Amino acid sequence: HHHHHHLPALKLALEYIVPCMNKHGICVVDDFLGKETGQQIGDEVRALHDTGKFTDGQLVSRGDKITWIEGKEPGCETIGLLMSSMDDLIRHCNGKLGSYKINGRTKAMVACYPGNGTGYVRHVDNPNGDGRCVTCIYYLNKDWDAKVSGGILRIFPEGKAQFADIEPKFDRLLFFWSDRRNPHEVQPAYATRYAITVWYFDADERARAKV
């Protein structure tokens, strides 16, 4: 609809992402890339699935299966654009996300929960200070109905009187602190559920992790 207009990355970062993250440690952004780009990502992810590029998560350690995407691979061009779009937002968050100085990230982890009641038990992404400070997730599930299909990400922010229910909605982008501040679970999914995750590194924590 031609009455709607995209917020520039700088505007979205400073007017929303930064304050929301510093206040709540969780930030949801809907309509990130638009319908055309979102569906195209859906196509690329389904292709990865169909061509058998996923490994079951019980080997990586949960009924998930995952594939790592660098972004430049043939057939992953749009996933690549998503990743550069994520980077753009983080860049504009300057050094305003707490006291972090982000200088790098993981590749993209494409995850599939193949319905059949599969999910992910309550966990912390980075409990052992491995350098990862911000989790960034993009969902690409067309017309997801959590009332029927489930698959809600429930986040339990540490020491807060509230929790967050995040439906894995088409074209939804999500940020949260990767550390113990945000334990979270993926509730059982009863339809094919896809997500793409990148983790951003804090320079010092990442350095102290391997050094």
Annotated binding-site residue numbers for 2-oxoglutarate: 193
Under the binding rule (CB under 5 A), the answer on residue 167 touching Fe ion is no
Phi, psi of 93 (to 5 degrees): -75, 0
Q: What residues make contact with ligand A1L0U under the rule CB under 6 A?
A: 57, 64, 66, 111, 120, 123, 125, 137, 153, 168, 184, 186, 195
> Among ligand A1L0U, Fe ion, none, what does residue 150 contact (CB within 5–8 Å per kind)?
none
Q: How many residues does the chain have?
A: 211
CB of 168 to ligand A1L0U, least distance (A): 6
Nearer to ligand A1L0U, 66 or 76 (CB): 66
Residue nearest to ligand A1L0U (CB): 153
Gap between the Cα atoms of 160 and 175, Å rounded: 17
- 171 has which bridge partners? none
Residue 75 has phi, psi (to 5 degrees) of 85, 5
Kindly tell me which of 31 and 96 has the beta carbon lying closer to ligand A1L0U. Answer: 31
- The span from the CA of 120 to the CA of 156, in Å, is 14
Q: Which is nearer to ligand A1L0U, 93 or 196 (CB)?
A: 196
Residue from 125, 167, 179, 202 in contact with Fe ion (CB under 5 A): 125
Please name the amino acid found at residue 210.
K
If the CB atoms of residues 64 and 202 are measured against Fe ion, the closer one turns out to be 64
CB of 192 to ligand A1L0U, least distance (A): 13
* Segment 34 to 73, residues that bind Fe ion, using CB under 5 A: none
Residue 64, contacted partner among ligand A1L0U, Fe ion, none, CB below 5-8 A by kind: ligand A1L0U
Cα-trace Rg, the chain: 16
What's the CA gap between 125 and 175, in Å, rounded?
12
